[model samples]
Target: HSDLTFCEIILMEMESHDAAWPFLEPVNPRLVSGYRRIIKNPMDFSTMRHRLSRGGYTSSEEFAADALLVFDNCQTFNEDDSEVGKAGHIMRRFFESRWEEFY
Candidate 1:
């Protein structure tokens, strides 16, 4: 439920079916709360869709906002974890995959 389409559908499914999800569980575990926060105070569900999209950027630094802000579905990463995780070219390839969605 991280993507724009998935998050919107998941929240609706969990609600209409009376399923104990998104609401029953910690909303922010996956940072889905960002959407719920706006949804809670909003007047319509459709208008709130973008809320989840922008909220994905709430966790990562704003330094790359110019890069990640281009997305409306999946969350993206600067993905330079090579500085910490000590990964090889395999790591950058993973970033490429994620960034592609944003692009």
Candidate 2:
């Protein structure tokens, strides 16, 4: 129960971050060719929020996994120097820092 709250707090922080724009919503498969095939398990802040609200995550670990997946997908699909890739790096660092503090 409390773990879900922790995830909600973390999700809010992630959503508020400036670098979170690119990850706010799922990548459009139509707009970005081959995105669906490349990123097998697509994730984003909105989806995380939905899952969290619906009790899709049973533990903090599960929540963390999805959070990391967003960054992993971003890094895989975009170059490090690209805008989205840089945001992913920044957000990943932010999440890790906050997660350590919480745990």
Candidate 3:
């Protein structure tokens, strides 16, 4: 999956413009519009943070809190793990999809 930690990737992506779009894309196409309404503006980090923190991978309370967070541009990965949907699966697809740039 990832060749680097998710945290590492997020920091790198933050340097690029439009870097965060892909992270929230997989959540659901319809939902992105709603998420962006809260995300694009710095005013609602609290609003979006609480929403994404509800539940998910990595015990991810801060997953969407940073607003600039994104996983698609990871340079390396220390480890990868399971998710409720596939639980790492035979291919660790969840991690790969999120950090495929590592390969």
Candidate 4:
């Protein structure tokens, strides 16, 4: 479907970026104390990929929402000046630019 195509393209680009490493997989709450407590709804690229493949998303907008949720959680958990936080900023900006062009 065209909707899945667009979202998949956007996801592919985001995944290739260096800043996307931290978000490529689910955050390990076990490794990071209080992570589960802080982020009630965690989002990640791997999860998004699966969701997309399983036809979990109804629209590209929903895909975008999950993508944004990844960044939102990153921002909530990491300081603005921290590595992960900076990555989230860059990734979010990249996603925004592509999103604006598509819709």
Candidate 5:
């Protein structure tokens, strides 16, 4: 089994990020690369759009199109299977460390 759970995790992360910050530019290379790798393999826009919308990004055709492209390039070279967990921890840490910034 190739661990489809990982795929679901990826989707969840994408959803969370999109919901929290749709237009926020990604600064982390790992984030950009992770999204790229999954979306690079010839995805259907309708399906992607539906997923993105379900995750909370407003249904903008332009944003969806650009998102696909951005995510495609984001995860192109990632090989770390542990990255998702690490990212989750890092996100928590970042929020904790920057509580003042968020407020």
Candidate 6:
């Protein structure tokens, strides 16, 4: 899915899950590892435009415009996903459950 919102959610989730681990005892290394994996391949619009041209896009500008549209659609999709809403609920619970622990 070419949605920026999804990307943004991924970024947020990565950060949240990453930060949450430090507060837990007997820390799970897997959580930190997974967070690193999620962040490993970050998207760069400029690099993407270059790659699109190499892949046969008529022009870099066209590729950039299309890529931007896909990113926009992705944002909308993430905004509408029930799973994302659920995750948000869980995040709230985590915060409320141990508000002091976070500090």
Candidate 4: stretches off by over 4 Å: none
Cα lDDT of model 5 by residue, 2-86, tens digit: 2323333443445465222422343443746455445444333334545555654443433334444433333343333446334
- What's model 2's lDDT at 79? 96
Candidate closer to the true structure by lDDT (higher is better), 5 or 6 = 5
Best-first order by TM-score: 4, 2, 5, 6, 1, 3
Stretches of candidate 1 off by over 4 Å are 21-54, 57-103
Answer with 1 or 3, whichever has the higher lDDT: 3
> For every model shown, what is its TM-score relative to the native structure?
0.21, 0.96, 0.19, 0.96, 0.26, 0.25
**Cα lDDT, all candidates:** 0.32, 0.94, 0.33, 0.93, 0.40, 0.38
Better of 3 and 5 by TM-score: 5
Weakest lDDT window of 10 consecutive positions for candidate 3: 70-79
1-103: candidate 6 lDDT, tens digit per residue: 2433333333344335633332223223375444334332333234443454356454334443443433332233334345533443444454344432332
Worst 10-residue lDDT window for candidate 5 reads: 1-10
Q: CA lDDT of 7 in candidate 2?
A: 87
lDDT, candidate 3, 1-103, per-residue tens: 2322453454344323242333322344274345434433332223333443453334323443333232311211112342311221322333335444444
Model 5 stretches with alpha carbons more than 4 Å out: 1-25, 28-59, 80-103
- What is candidate 1's CA lDDT for residue 49? 34
lDDT of 4 by residue, 1-103 (tens): 7878999899999989988989999999999999999999999999999999899999888999999999999999999999999999999999999998988
Pairs clashing within candidate 5: 32-74, 33-74, 33-75, 34-75, 36-71, 36-72, 36-75
Model 3, residue pairs in steric clash: 3-76, 3-77, 4-76, 4-77, 5-77
> Pick by lDDT: which candidate is best?
2
Which residue pairs in candidate 6 have backbone atoms (N, alpha carbon, C) closer than 3 angstroms, thus clashing?
A: 3-74, 4-75, 5-75
Per-residue CA lDDT of model 2 for 1-103, tens digit only, reads 8887888899999999999999999888999998988999999999999998889998999999999999999999999999889989999999999999999
* Error in Å for residue 43 of model 1: 22
Better of 2 and 5 by TM-score: 2
